[PDB]
Amino acid sequence: EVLLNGDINFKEVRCVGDNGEVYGIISSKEALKIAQNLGLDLVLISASAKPPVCKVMDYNKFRYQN
């Protein structure tokens, strides 16, 4: 239901961490590189938002929040 990791393809995303960390507006490729280097997932929160909002977080935690 939720797009993750390599399935998130946008030229620009607003990338936020799980405790208020600001990464700014970066490519989905850059956001994925940050998530991978931090041992985390990239989770698409909103594609409707412009630019789309992604979080760098543990997907297992996202899944259980919902």
C-alpha of 52 from chain center:
9
Token pair 């030229």 is at which residue? 11
3-class state of residue 31 by DSSP: helix
**Residue 12, token pair as written in the block:** 């620009």
Let me know the angle formed at the C-alpha of 56 by 55 and 62, rounded to the nearest 5 degrees. Answer: 70
Question: How many structural domains compose the chain?
Answer: 1
Q: Which domain holds residue 53?
A: 1-66
| CATH number of residue 65's parent domain | 3.10.20.80
Pairing of strands 22-26, 53-57: unpaired
> For this experimental structure, what is the resolution in angstroms?
1.8
Cα–Cα distance, 63 to 53 (Å, whole number): 17
Phi, psi values for residue 19, rounded to 5° = -130, 40
**Sheet containing 22-26: order of strands:** 22-26, 13-17, 53-57, 41-46
